Amino acid sequence: AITVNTNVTSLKAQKNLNTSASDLATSMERLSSGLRINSAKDDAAGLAISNRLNS
Amino acid sequence: AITVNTNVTSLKAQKNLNTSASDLATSMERLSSGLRINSAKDDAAGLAISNRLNS
Amino acid sequence: QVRGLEVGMRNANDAISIAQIAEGAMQEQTNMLQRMRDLTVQSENGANSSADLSALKAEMDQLANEIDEIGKTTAFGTTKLLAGGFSAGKNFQVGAQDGEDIKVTVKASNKSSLSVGSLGNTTSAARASSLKKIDAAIKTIDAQRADLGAIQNRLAHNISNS
Amino acid sequence: ALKAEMDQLANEIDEIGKTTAFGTTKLLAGGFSAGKNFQVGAQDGEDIKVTVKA
């Protein structure tokens, strides 16, 4: 069909572009900080193990 | 999202860069002076113990 | 269904925001507890006198005051997050139909609930007791941060599927 | 800690299982386990069956 009111290819392209931008921002943060684990989003058990090793 | 009005990656990079600059300035001061304790910010009990040993 | 999924993704991003603020607040608390642990280990030195012990304890008290301040001050606009208002979680409807929702739970974390608000260092037994309670506090903050991280991962997958 | 994250992931697998719909009809809960027919031709019996299990 040739339709004007809905465009699905654009929706899917938007979602892919957003995923790529998120990944790039995460990498930029990790290079700026120098650490792999900046939150518990990253690795939760490693956070606690590293707190104990830090103590 | 692709936004122009707010940039959070830049905010976080600014904070990391400021932390690094502060640490470098502290180290430079300590090497220029030759002392570990330049203020009571550094070690408060050691300051008093060292005042008594100096007496 | 389309319109409800749009609003539900908005609610999910709100939940991610709340969890991210609280999780970031707990890191400074961990940092200050590590500092107090070092001060407590330094108190166990047979060359310290009462004046040195008083200096060490004055800094411990200031650190406990800042832990309490972070506990009562953290907010999302005007609603408090670390004071006990999320101890029984709040629901965010992340779908188009009723009952499709995720619960965000945060317990209170301050110098009174962490049991670090009355530590001493003037006697050997007091130092031992302070060491044990600081280690326990570090453990409980780790557990809270673990649960908030799991919630954030879950919300990411859910937004992708929507 | 590891197991707490495993449990949250299993909860989200269950949520996707019960939530997926076409408007208001559920798709991954077992309603298509014995498939439904769509008549794709002009005469009776010319049809295709779509089967989805829970």
Added chain:
Amino acid sequence: SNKSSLSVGSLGNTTSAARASSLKKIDAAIKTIDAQRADLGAIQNRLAHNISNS
């Protein structure tokens, strides 16, 4: 068809149960309007055929 016959004239949102109740009644109202529009459309089709035959 008005806010009194559709039962949407007193909806609340201050409590969890009030939100659930409001959701159910809004969905029901959408359904009843759909049914009315269906019957009016059938009537219009019928009148078209009848005018053609006349």
Added chain:
Amino acid sequence: ANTQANVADAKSRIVDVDFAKETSQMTKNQVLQQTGSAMLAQANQLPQVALSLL
């Protein structure tokens, strides 16, 4: 500093526009404007069948 970053992120999620979505909506409405203009210009020529009958 931490809290300022997280709260500015939170506010941006609510207030700021999405360019990827909004440019798509703009292009759709552009095409619809051109189509509706053509269709209205063609619609204003319907009373000229009477001149043929006349």
